[PDB]
Scaffold this active site. Structure first.
Site, PDB file in Angstrom:
ATOM      1  N   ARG A 184       0.799  -1.087  -0.014  1.00 33.12           N
ATOM      2  CA  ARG A 184       0.210  -0.095   0.236  1.00 33.12           C
ATOM      3  C   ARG A 184       0.957   1.320  -0.078  1.00 33.12           C
ATOM      4  O   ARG A 184       1.858   1.421   0.704  1.00 33.12           O
ATOM      5  CB  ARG A 184      -0.973   0.132   1.203  1.00 33.12           C
ATOM      6  CG  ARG A 184      -1.878  -1.041   1.332  1.00 33.12           C
ATOM      7  CD  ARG A 184      -2.500  -1.455   0.253  1.00 33.12           C
ATOM      8  NE  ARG A 184      -3.539  -2.391   0.435  1.00 33.12           N
ATOM      9  CZ  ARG A 184      -4.287  -3.100  -0.463  1.00 33.12           C
ATOM     10  NH1 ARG A 184      -3.743  -3.245  -1.710  1.00 33.12           N
ATOM     11  NH2 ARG A 184      -5.056  -3.940  -0.121  1.00 33.12           N
ATOM     12  N   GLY A 185       0.083   2.184  -0.616  1.00 32.54           N
ATOM     13  CA  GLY A 185       0.871   3.638  -0.599  1.00 32.54           C
ATOM     14  C   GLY A 185       1.293   3.967   0.727  1.00 32.54           C
ATOM     15  O   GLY A 185       2.375   4.548   1.014  1.00 32.54           O
ATOM     16  N   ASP A 206     -12.790 -10.864   8.115  1.00 33.88           N
ATOM     17  CA  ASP A 206     -12.644 -10.202   6.776  1.00 33.88           C
ATOM     18  C   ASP A 206     -13.533 -10.741   5.705  1.00 33.88           C
ATOM     19  O   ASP A 206     -14.388 -11.189   5.954  1.00 33.88           O
ATOM     20  CB  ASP A 206     -10.991 -10.369   6.499  1.00 33.88           C
ATOM     21  CG  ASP A 206     -10.585 -11.816   6.213  1.00 33.88           C
ATOM     22  OD1 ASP A 206     -11.538 -12.398   5.785  1.00 33.88           O
ATOM     23  OD2 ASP A 206      -9.425 -11.935   6.121  1.00 33.88           O
TER      24      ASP A 206
HETATM   25  C1  LIG Z   1     -12.823  -0.134   0.724  1.00 31.24           C
HETATM   26  C2  LIG Z   1     -12.083  -0.880   1.650  1.00 31.24           C
HETATM   27  C3  LIG Z   1     -10.838  -1.349   1.311  1.00 31.24           C
HETATM   28  C4  LIG Z   1     -10.066  -2.015   2.032  1.00 31.24           C
HETATM   29  C5  LIG Z   1     -10.469  -1.980   3.417  1.00 31.24           C
HETATM   30  C6  LIG Z   1     -11.884  -1.816   3.739  1.00 31.24           C
HETATM   31  C7  LIG Z   1     -12.528  -1.119   2.788  1.00 31.24           C
HETATM   32  C8  LIG Z   1     -14.195  -0.690   3.273  1.00 31.24           C
HETATM   33  C9  LIG Z   1     -12.098  -2.329   5.285  1.00 31.24           C
HETATM   34  C10 LIG Z   1     -11.637  -1.376   6.152  1.00 31.24           C
HETATM   35  C11 LIG Z   1     -13.703  -2.317   5.518  1.00 31.24           C
HETATM   36  C12 LIG Z   1     -11.986  -3.655   5.779  1.00 31.24           C
HETATM   37  C13 LIG Z   1     -10.235  -3.981   5.071  1.00 31.24           C
HETATM   38  S1  LIG Z   1     -10.202  -5.543   4.131  1.00 31.24           S
HETATM   39  O1  LIG Z   1     -10.988  -5.437   2.922  1.00 31.24           O
HETATM   40  O2  LIG Z   1      -8.747  -5.775   4.217  1.00 31.24           O
HETATM   41  O3  LIG Z   1     -10.790  -6.863   4.949  1.00 31.24           O
HETATM   42  N1  LIG Z   1      -9.661  -2.714   4.354  1.00 31.24           N
HETATM   43  C14 LIG Z   1      -8.309  -2.663   4.136  1.00 31.24           C
HETATM   44  C15 LIG Z   1      -7.879  -2.579   2.795  1.00 31.24           C
HETATM   45  N2  LIG Z   1      -6.415  -2.621   2.398  1.00 31.24           N
HETATM   46  C16 LIG Z   1      -5.507  -2.624   3.469  1.00 31.24           C
HETATM   47  O4  LIG Z   1      -4.061  -2.749   3.120  1.00 31.24           O
HETATM   48  N3  LIG Z   1      -5.868  -3.127   4.663  1.00 31.24           N
HETATM   49  C17 LIG Z   1      -7.301  -3.111   5.162  1.00 31.24           C
HETATM   50  O5  LIG Z   1      -7.393  -3.174   6.255  1.00 31.24           O
HETATM   51  N4  LIG Z   1      -8.981  -2.255   1.944  1.00 31.24           N
HETATM   52  C18 LIG Z   1      -8.270  -1.965   0.436  1.00 31.24           C
HETATM   53  C19 LIG Z   1      -7.506  -0.780   0.092  1.00 31.24           C
HETATM   54  O6  LIG Z   1      -8.090   0.561   0.796  1.00 31.24           O
HETATM   55  C20 LIG Z   1      -7.617  -0.489  -1.827  1.00 31.24           C
HETATM   56  O7  LIG Z   1      -6.988  -1.608  -1.825  1.00 31.24           O
HETATM   57  C21 LIG Z   1      -6.876   0.848  -2.141  1.00 31.24           C
HETATM   58  O8  LIG Z   1      -7.098   0.950  -3.134  1.00 31.24           O
HETATM   59  C22 LIG Z   1      -5.477   0.923  -1.493  1.00 31.24           C
HETATM   60  O9  LIG Z   1      -5.056   2.141  -1.805  1.00 31.24           O
HETATM   61  P1  LIG Z   1      -3.357   2.216  -2.126  1.00 31.24           P
HETATM   62  O10 LIG Z   1      -2.507   2.095  -0.936  1.00 31.24           O
HETATM   63  O11 LIG Z   1      -3.025   1.251  -3.176  1.00 31.24           O
HETATM   64  O12 LIG Z   1      -3.314   3.742  -2.588  1.00 31.24           O
HETATM   65 MN   LIG Z   2      -2.392   5.139  -3.790  1.00 36.10          MN
END
Ligand SMILES: Cc1cc2c3c(c1C)C(C)(C)C[C@@H](S(=O)(=O)O)N3c1c([nH]c(=O)[nH]c1=O)N2C[C@H](O)[C@H](O)[C@H](O)COP(=O)(O)O
Ligand SMILES: [Mn+2]
Ligand SMILES: Cc1cc2c3c(c1C)C(C)(C)C[C@@H](S(=O)(=O)O)N3c1c([nH]c(=O)[nH]c1=O)N2C[C@H](O)[C@H](O)[C@H](O)COP(=O)(O)O
Ligand SMILES: [Mn+2]
Ligand code: NA
Ligand code: NA
Lengths: 469, 459
Positions: free
Chosen positions: A174-175, A267
């Site tokens: 991640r960023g 998750d």
């Molecule tokens: C939409 C969303 C996304 C994410 C998540 C969640 C949500 C609602 C929550 C907080 C509910 C749960 C987890 S989970 O899906 O991994 O089970 N969460 C999450 C996580 N990415 C991550 O590294 N840890 C995380 O904890 N992800 C993914 C992450 O934000 C996504 O991949 C972004 O595009 C990452 O941006 P960059 O770091 O690549 O800029």
């Molecule tokens: Mn990014």
């Protein structure tokens, strides 16, 4: 310029937002209600009376594809295809479209700092019975690295561990995580400033979760979705910018070397993942609007809101698959397949054995689908998004032993415990297309087609028939 | 500029031999060309073909060098740069129209041309280096393809385009958009090398092969309107045949020996009726043959693989090399070397080969190896296969996949299986054993022996 509240008003006008006045606990109860609602394709939910708190709780915001689309000012989802085409060309100088910085913003109406910071006043949800603690799930984490100016936005889950302490669970690619890692190398022992915005405008939220390259600010992408620059404000205790319309902002830092056991938490796979160490985010300031609303969600056994989001954002890759395989009419990863583990692909079949080439294409062409364990291929008379069509096709167009392809010893997600060995497992494709001469010696069935004249005539008298009323 | 300028260049460099002895276009030329090709010899110009006055040129591209020379370049490794250009494809050069002197009408007589008969049981003389030019009804693009053409009469040839070719698709669409109307077609013999090479390069159906020849050449392709239709043919061509296909007219074609080394059985294809023949004054007839490999088409096909390597690498940057041995009938076996990054990686690469580009859709064997293997040396490849594979564990078989309908080895026409051999080093998870450490030489010893080699005087 539409903030989140303007969006909630739009939704309410369209019967897409329900206000719940009954008392409901953020500990487990909200999740249960949201889960039933999402599973029935219902509205977004605003809990005006959370037990033990004064701040309303918003969830299931993006529980439906429609609401994802509405969140980008559209009728339907296919503007995401255009983004896909854009992100392709790069591997358009006015995609360096910056933020518009206000001095003073609604999100800084009320400010609390140092010892007055108390995250326990916020209705943070506990989603599942064996989850370790309340969890912040819709925070836009904002970070800068030491080498470029770009601000990354990511959603990283954040466990509550104290009045002013959260765990920051960014996975290592991640960023945010890469920024922190670089900060550590470049400035040993100095605190890493970070900020988290809750309840920004929908384009910013959607932009945060679009997979843009590390080189670009997710704020720039939100700008393209919106049609206008993203409105932001400088944080009080650092040089990061957060969205001006945000309902709540947490500001603070990561003390180098400070870590805590995170989880377990349920998750998107439907299982609990085991405890593991992540950095501690120390919160020095909380800024919020008057009458602030807390935006939350949950992840669990799919489908859930993240999975519905993930489906809408897969539209970003369909055109790249179709450039390469123009025979592909649709390509769908059901949420209920943990978002990536099962694909349904519909084609216009052009020769015997075509389905096998498509399977191999899915399993090889893009890294996004290399770990997809099951692939079902069907003809274009099937709606890939309706299990009634797909099961019909499977059960009327396959002989299982003839039409099932198995490949052993292929790359699999290390976290998938169902494979025999970590990182290595098998894959299955189901060829559920109509079989051509050569593939079968039987006389293949002619499907039943309706008479369009009868259909139109019945359309014409339908209201008058009055069967319902 | 034109073909004759290319022949003169080749002659200056000892790459073109003029044969003055009498030689029959019935079988004999093929025998001579085959020996010559097999020994890496020059291109051949038969000035005294038995029974004809028009010289016969063949084995033009019998060597990789001459293929490169044909695109103005000094080396076979310049073809990679062409591949990088052929890549340009995402989103968000025309012909120059101006020679050939004499012409026919009702006294069209293809029997005056020294058309070759290649193998003893071939059905009739066969035209083998004709650039067939076609337009479809829906786009303006002019396709160029090489489709073998059997002699069946003073003015009739069979047009053997397989069904996925530009020409065949154009004809199929023309029929349907204009029932019962004649389909104009033209065939150019002895165009300039860039045009020829452009014609055989698999550019997308959307793009005229004339445009690509322009990029290879550095300049727009010089062309001329045909006499009896609106198609344009290369201005420097030695011979041009113009005519049409009568809808529904077909003839039994073959048998003919193929690039696979076997005879194709008889099959039906459209008849091309020739209304005009145009040529240069001291016209030269360009021909070739296919047979058991290697032959000229297979040498062509090897050079054109160098073009594809970059396009494969853009998509799979783990691929170090990608080779289709001529001995595998040019397309049926591929060796791929990779820099392996995770357990099971080889499988992704096999599936990529079988799915990414259409020219490899029918490749029945794919061997994957690590980057310490030279894909072009069977000594390395067999060494890898026999020291890095457990056959049952590391062989992938997929049934019921698309296969060339002429491949008589598959159990059913058009449908058959594929095999991938994962001959990479096996990582933890793929094996529980202690994997072998290969023997590496000491570079100091190597260099010291290089230094005294001459003084040692073993040879
Ligand atoms: C939409 C969303 C996304 C994410 C998540 C969640 C949500 C609602 C929550 C907080 C509910 C749960 C987890 S989970 O899906 O991994 O089970 N969460 C999450 C996580 N990415 C991550 O590294 N840890 C995380 O904890 N992800 C993914 C992450 O934000 C996504 O991949 C972004 O595009 C990452 O941006 P960059 O770091 O690549 O800029
Ligand atoms: Mn990014
Ligand atoms: C260089 C060459 C190529 C080709 C051929 C021949 C040569 C010398 C000859 C005439 C000697 C032999 C046959 S054979 O290899 O199929 O036996 N020939 C040939 C045939 N493609 C085809 O559909 N029919 C053919 O008859 N091919 C392949 C084809 O011309 C080539 O792949 C073009 O790129 C295809 O044209 P498009 O339809 O792609 O525009
Ligand atoms: Mn073409
Ligand atoms: Na992001
Ligand atoms: Na071609």
């Amino acid at each position: 310029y539409n903030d989140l509240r303007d969006f909630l008003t739009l939704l309410e006008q369209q019967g897409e937002l329900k206000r719940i006045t009954l008392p409901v606990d953020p500990h487990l109860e909200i999740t249960e209600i949201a889960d039933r609602t999402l599973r029935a394709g219902g509205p977004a939910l605003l809990f005006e009376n959370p037990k033990g708190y004064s701040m309303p709780v918003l969830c299931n915001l993006f529980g439906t594809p429609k609401r994802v689309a509405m969140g980008m000012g559209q009728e339907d989802v296919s503007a995401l295809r255009e983004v896909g085409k854009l992100l392709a060309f790069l591997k358009k100088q006015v995609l360096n479209m910056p933020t518009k910085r206000l001095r003073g913003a609604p999100c800084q109406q009320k400010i609390v700092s140092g010892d007055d910071v108390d995250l326990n006043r916020i209705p943070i949800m506990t989603c599942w019975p064996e989850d370790a603690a309340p969890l912040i799930t819709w925070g836009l984490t904002v970070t800068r690295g030491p080498h470029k100016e770009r601000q990354n936005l990511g959603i990283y889950r954040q466990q509550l561990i104290g009045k002013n302490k959260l765990i920051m669970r960014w996975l290592s690619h991640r960023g945010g995580a890469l920024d922190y890692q670089e900060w550590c190398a470049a400035h040993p022992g100095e605190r890493f400033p970070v900020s988290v915005a809750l309840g920004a405008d929908p384009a910013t939220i959607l932009g945060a979760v679009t997979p843009v390259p590390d080189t670009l600010s997710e704020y720039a992408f939100a700008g393209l979705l919106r049609g206008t620059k993203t409105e932001v404000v400088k944080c009080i205790s650092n040089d990061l910018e957060v969205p001006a319309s945000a309902e709540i902002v947490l500001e603070g830092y990561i003390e180098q070397g400070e870590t805590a056991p995170e989880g377990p938490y349920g998750d998107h796979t439907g299982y609990y993942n085991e405890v593991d160490s992540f950095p501690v985010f120390t919160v020095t300031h909380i800024t919020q609007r008057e009458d602030a609303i807390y935006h939350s969600t949950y992840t669990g056994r799919p489908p859930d809101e993240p999975a519905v989001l993930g489906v809408a954002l897969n539209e970003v890759f369909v055109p790249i698959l179709q450039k390469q395989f123009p025979e592909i009419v649709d390509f769908y990863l059901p949420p209920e397949g943990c978002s990536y583990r099962l694909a349904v692909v519909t084609i216009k079949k052009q020769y015997a054995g075509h389905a096998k080439r498509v399977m191999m294409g899915v399993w090889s062409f893009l890294r996004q689908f290399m770990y997809t364990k099951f692939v079902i291929v069907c003809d274009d008379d099937v709606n890939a998004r309706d299990w009634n069509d797909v099961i019909w096709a499977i059960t009327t167009r396959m002989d299982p032993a003839r039409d099932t392809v198995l490949v052993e010893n292929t790359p699999i997600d290390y976290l998938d415990f169902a494979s025999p060995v970590s990182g290595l497992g098998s894959k299955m494709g189901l060829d559920a297309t109509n079989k051509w001469p050569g593939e079968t010696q039987r006389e293949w069935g002619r499907p039943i087609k309706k008479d369009p004249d009868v259909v139109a005539h019945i359309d014409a008298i339908w209201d008058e028939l009055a069967i319902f009323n």
